[PDB]
Coordinates of C-alpha atoms and ligand atoms in Angstrom, one line a residue:
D29 CA 1.6 19.1 -20.7
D30 CA 1.3 20.5 -17.1
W31 CA -1.1 18.8 -14.7
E32 CA -3.1 21.5 -13.1
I33 CA -6.9 21.5 -13.5
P34 CA -8.7 24.9 -13.7
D35 CA -11.4 25.6 -11.1
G36 CA -14.9 24.3 -11.9
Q37 CA -13.7 21.3 -13.9
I38 CA -13.8 18.8 -11.0
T39 CA -17.3 17.8 -9.9
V40 CA -17.0 16.5 -6.4
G41 CA -19.6 14.0 -5.3
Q42 CA -19.9 11.2 -2.7
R43 CA -17.6 11.3 0.4
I44 CA -16.0 7.8 0.6
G45 CA -13.4 8.2 3.4
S46 CA -10.0 9.4 4.3
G47 CA -6.4 9.1 3.0
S48 CA -3.1 10.7 4.1
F49 CA -3.6 14.4 4.6
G50 CA -7.2 14.7 3.2
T51 CA -10.7 13.4 2.5
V52 CA -11.4 11.1 -0.4
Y53 CA -14.4 11.5 -2.7
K54 CA -15.8 9.9 -5.9
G55 CA -15.8 12.6 -8.6
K56 CA -16.3 13.2 -12.3
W57 CA -13.5 14.6 -14.6
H58 CA -13.6 13.0 -18.1
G59 CA -15.3 10.0 -16.5
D60 CA -15.3 8.6 -13.0
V61 CA -12.3 9.7 -10.8
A62 CA -11.2 9.6 -7.2
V63 CA -10.5 12.9 -5.5
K64 CA -8.5 13.4 -2.4
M65 CA -9.1 16.9 -1.0
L66 CA -7.8 19.0 1.9
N67 CA -11.2 20.9 2.4
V68 CA -9.4 23.4 4.7
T69 CA -10.4 27.0 4.2
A70 CA -6.6 28.0 4.1
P71 CA -3.7 25.6 3.9
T72 CA -0.6 25.7 6.3
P73 CA 2.8 25.8 4.7
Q74 CA 3.0 22.5 6.5
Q75 CA 0.1 21.1 4.5
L76 CA 1.1 23.0 1.3
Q77 CA 4.4 21.2 1.5
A78 CA 3.1 17.6 1.9
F79 CA 0.7 18.3 -1.0
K80 CA 3.5 19.5 -3.4
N81 CA 5.6 16.6 -2.2
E82 CA 3.0 13.9 -3.1
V83 CA 2.2 15.4 -6.5
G84 CA 6.0 15.5 -7.3
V85 CA 6.1 11.8 -6.4
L86 CA 3.0 10.7 -8.3
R87 CA 4.0 12.4 -11.5
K88 CA 7.1 10.1 -11.7
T89 CA 4.8 7.0 -11.8
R90 CA 3.3 5.6 -14.9
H91 CA 2.5 1.9 -14.4
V92 CA -0.4 -0.6 -14.7
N93 CA -0.1 -1.5 -11.0
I94 CA 0.4 2.1 -9.7
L95 CA -2.9 4.0 -9.2
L96 CA -2.9 6.4 -12.2
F97 CA -2.3 10.0 -11.2
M98 CA -4.5 12.1 -13.5
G99 CA -4.2 15.7 -12.3
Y100 CA -4.2 18.1 -9.3
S101 CA -6.0 21.3 -8.2
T102 CA -5.0 24.1 -5.9
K103 CA -7.9 26.3 -6.9
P104 CA -11.0 25.8 -4.9
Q105 CA -9.0 23.6 -2.4
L106 CA -5.9 21.4 -2.6
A107 CA -6.8 18.2 -4.3
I108 CA -5.4 15.2 -6.2
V109 CA -7.3 13.4 -9.0
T110 CA -6.7 9.8 -9.9
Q111 CA -8.5 7.1 -11.9
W112 CA -11.5 5.3 -10.3
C113 CA -11.4 1.7 -9.0
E114 CA -14.9 0.1 -9.0
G115 CA -14.6 -2.7 -6.4
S116 CA -13.0 -2.1 -3.0
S117 CA -9.5 -2.1 -1.4
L118 CA -7.7 -5.4 -0.5
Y119 CA -8.2 -4.6 3.3
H120 CA -11.9 -4.3 2.7
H121 CA -12.0 -7.5 0.7
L122 CA -10.2 -9.5 3.4
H123 CA -11.3 -8.1 6.7
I124 CA -14.7 -6.4 6.0
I125 CA -16.7 -8.2 3.4
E126 CA -14.6 -11.3 3.8
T127 CA -14.1 -12.3 0.2
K128 CA -13.0 -15.9 -0.1
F129 CA -10.4 -15.6 -2.9
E130 CA -9.1 -18.7 -4.6
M131 CA -5.4 -19.4 -4.0
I132 CA -4.4 -18.9 -7.7
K133 CA -5.9 -15.4 -7.5
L134 CA -4.3 -14.6 -4.1
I135 CA -0.8 -15.3 -5.6
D136 CA -1.7 -13.1 -8.6
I137 CA -2.7 -10.2 -6.3
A138 CA 0.7 -10.8 -4.5
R139 CA 2.4 -10.9 -7.9
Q140 CA 1.0 -7.5 -9.0
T141 CA 1.7 -5.8 -5.7
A142 CA 5.3 -7.0 -6.0
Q143 CA 5.3 -5.8 -9.6
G144 CA 4.3 -2.3 -8.6
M145 CA 6.8 -1.9 -5.8
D146 CA 9.6 -3.2 -8.0
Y147 CA 8.7 -0.3 -10.3
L148 CA 8.6 2.3 -7.5
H149 CA 12.0 1.1 -6.0
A150 CA 13.5 1.1 -9.5
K151 CA 12.5 4.8 -9.5
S152 CA 13.8 5.3 -5.9
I153 CA 10.4 5.8 -4.4
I154 CA 9.8 4.5 -0.9
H155 CA 6.1 4.3 -0.1
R156 CA 6.5 4.2 3.7
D157 CA 2.8 3.3 4.2
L158 CA 2.2 0.1 2.2
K159 CA -0.8 -1.7 3.7
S160 CA -3.8 -3.6 2.4
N161 CA -5.8 -0.4 2.7
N162 CA -3.5 1.2 0.1
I163 CA -3.8 -1.8 -2.3
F164 CA -6.9 -1.3 -4.5
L165 CA -8.6 -3.9 -6.6
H166 CA -9.7 -2.5 -9.9
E167 CA -12.8 -4.3 -11.4
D168 CA -11.8 -7.2 -9.0
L169 CA -8.9 -8.4 -11.2
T170 CA -6.1 -5.7 -11.2
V171 CA -4.0 -4.4 -8.3
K172 CA -3.4 -0.6 -8.1
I173 CA -1.1 0.6 -5.4
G174 CA -2.4 3.9 -4.1
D175 CA -1.9 6.7 -1.6
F176 CA 1.6 8.3 -1.8
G177 CA 1.1 10.9 0.9
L178 CA 4.0 9.6 2.9
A179 CA 6.3 8.4 0.0
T180 CA 9.8 9.9 -0.5
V181 CA 12.5 10.2 -3.2
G196 CA -0.4 5.7 12.0
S197 CA -1.1 2.1 11.0
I198 CA 1.4 -0.1 12.9
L199 CA 0.7 -3.7 11.8
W200 CA 2.7 -3.2 8.6
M201 CA 5.6 -1.5 10.3
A202 CA 9.0 -3.1 10.5
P203 CA 10.5 -3.4 14.0
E204 CA 13.2 -0.8 13.1
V205 CA 10.5 1.7 12.2
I206 CA 8.5 0.8 15.4
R207 CA 11.3 1.7 17.8
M208 CA 11.9 5.2 16.4
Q209 CA 15.7 5.3 15.9
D210 CA 17.9 6.5 14.3
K211 CA 16.8 9.5 12.2
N212 CA 15.5 7.6 9.2
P213 CA 14.3 4.0 9.6
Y214 CA 12.4 4.0 6.3
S215 CA 14.1 2.0 3.5
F216 CA 13.5 -0.3 0.6
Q217 CA 13.8 -3.0 3.3
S218 CA 11.1 -1.5 5.5
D219 CA 8.8 -1.4 2.4
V220 CA 9.6 -5.1 1.9
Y221 CA 8.5 -5.9 5.4
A222 CA 5.1 -4.1 4.8
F223 CA 4.7 -6.3 1.7
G224 CA 5.5 -9.3 3.9
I225 CA 2.4 -8.5 6.1
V226 CA 0.1 -8.1 3.1
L227 CA 1.4 -11.6 2.0
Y228 CA 0.4 -12.7 5.5
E229 CA -3.1 -11.2 5.1
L230 CA -3.4 -12.9 1.7
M231 CA -2.2 -16.4 2.8
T232 CA -4.0 -16.3 6.2
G233 CA -7.1 -14.1 5.5
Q234 CA -6.4 -12.6 8.9
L235 CA -4.8 -9.5 10.4
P236 CA -1.6 -10.3 12.4
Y237 CA -1.6 -10.6 16.2
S238 CA -5.5 -11.0 16.0
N239 CA -5.4 -12.7 19.4
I240 CA -3.9 -9.7 21.3
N241 CA -6.2 -6.9 22.2
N242 CA -3.7 -4.4 23.5
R243 CA -2.1 -2.1 20.8
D244 CA 0.7 -0.6 23.0
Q245 CA 1.6 -4.2 23.8
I246 CA 1.8 -5.1 20.1
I247 CA 3.9 -2.0 19.5
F248 CA 6.2 -2.6 22.5
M249 CA 6.6 -6.3 21.6
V250 CA 7.4 -6.0 17.9
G251 CA 10.0 -3.4 18.7
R252 CA 12.0 -5.5 21.1
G253 CA 11.4 -8.5 18.8
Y254 CA 9.4 -10.7 21.2
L255 CA 6.5 -10.9 18.8
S256 CA 6.5 -11.8 15.1
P257 CA 3.7 -12.9 12.8
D258 CA 2.6 -16.5 13.4
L259 CA 3.4 -18.1 10.1
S260 CA 2.0 -21.5 10.9
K261 CA -1.4 -20.0 10.2
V262 CA -1.1 -20.0 6.4
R263 CA -3.8 -22.0 4.8
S264 CA -2.8 -25.6 3.9
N265 CA -2.8 -25.2 0.1
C266 CA -0.4 -22.2 0.3
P267 CA 2.8 -23.4 -1.5
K268 CA 6.0 -24.1 0.6
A269 CA 7.8 -21.7 -1.7
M270 CA 5.4 -18.9 -0.8
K271 CA 5.7 -19.6 2.9
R272 CA 9.5 -19.4 2.5
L273 CA 9.4 -16.0 0.8
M274 CA 7.1 -14.7 3.6
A275 CA 9.6 -15.6 6.3
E276 CA 12.3 -14.0 4.2
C277 CA 10.4 -10.7 4.1
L278 CA 9.5 -10.7 7.8
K279 CA 13.1 -10.8 8.9
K280 CA 13.7 -8.9 12.1
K281 CA 17.1 -7.8 10.9
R282 CA 16.4 -5.5 7.8
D283 CA 19.5 -6.5 5.7
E284 CA 18.3 -10.2 5.8
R285 CA 15.3 -9.2 3.6
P286 CA 15.3 -9.5 -0.2
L287 CA 14.7 -6.6 -2.5
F288 CA 11.7 -6.6 -4.9
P289 CA 13.5 -7.6 -8.1
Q290 CA 14.5 -10.9 -6.3
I291 CA 11.0 -11.2 -4.6
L292 CA 9.1 -10.8 -7.9
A293 CA 11.2 -13.5 -9.6
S294 CA 10.3 -15.9 -6.8
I295 CA 6.5 -15.3 -7.1
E296 CA 6.7 -15.7 -10.9
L297 CA 8.6 -19.0 -10.5
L298 CA 6.0 -20.4 -8.0
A299 CA 3.3 -19.1 -10.4
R300 CA 4.2 -21.2 -13.4
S301 CA 4.5 -24.4 -11.5
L302 CA 1.1 -24.0 -9.8
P303 CA -1.8 -24.7 -12.3
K304 CA -0.2 -28.0 -13.3
Ligands
SM6_1 C1 -13.7 3.4 1.6 C2 -12.3 4.1 1.7 O1 -11.6 4.0 0.4 C3 -10.9 5.0 -0.1 O2 -10.1 5.7 0.6 C4 -10.7 4.9 -1.5 S1 -12.0 4.2 -2.4 C5 -11.1 4.5 -3.9 C6 -11.4 4.2 -5.2 N1 -10.6 4.4 -6.3 C7 -9.4 5.0 -6.0 C8 -9.0 5.4 -4.8 C9 -9.8 5.1 -3.7 C10 -9.6 5.4 -2.2 N2 -8.4 6.0 -1.7 C11 -7.6 6.9 -2.1 C12 -6.3 7.0 -1.5 C13 -5.3 7.9 -1.8 C14 -5.6 8.8 -2.9 C15 -6.8 8.8 -3.5 C16 -7.8 7.9 -3.2 C17 -6.9 9.8 -4.6 C18 -5.5 10.5 -4.5 C19 -4.7 9.8 -3.4 N3 -3.6 10.1 -3.0 O3 -2.6 9.5 -3.8

């Protein structure tokens, strides 16, 4: 049953980038896998803890739309092994290679991301770092929500105002996750990162916190359904309690889906 992998089983190859608390690599372990690794000579109890935390979280997830946790290793170094996604993250698709997705597809990406979160929230798992960087597109047609380093039971554009102005003790809730999802909906419908016309970060932070700046929703592409625009505004509510929860969100996306191809 248990998920530890004995030393020497994980062949670590190409370095591909970074995730929360570690470096990501493409590896082999009964096929292609992704490997997030500490690569520190000796781990701090600080690091040891965030590692044991994440593993504990991942092992409660088993879902199409949640990046499949496969195993962990503490042996050569601290490392988490997950399935491989050939074809890049949603952030990369949108703001790096500039994939021009069709609308029908964009809504389906949004329908799966919603689907995955509903699952996590049903299991009382707050992601706390949802962004397009953490939304992976497996073989170009299947959304896998990844990176649970911050989840519970640095990147500010997806952060709800409440979270931005650090008060009280815990600003992170289902509602804060909904906000994050709201911004990825923005990226999808606009093909742009929010506040793109402001070049000062500490201004964007300040301003979102005091609520002087919200995402400019009149930038959604003309064939984005009125129903979809409405849901987006609902997610990006400054007051957190005026946001819907994912069960209600998902329903809306599935209703606008059926009345689209016709
Ligand atoms: C170019 C940078 O991209 C990366 O960071 C990539 S490319 C890729 C491909 N397939 C799966 C994951 C990834 C990935 N990121 C991640 C992010 C978090 C991860 C991870 C891989 C393995 C365990 C873990 N924590 O839960």
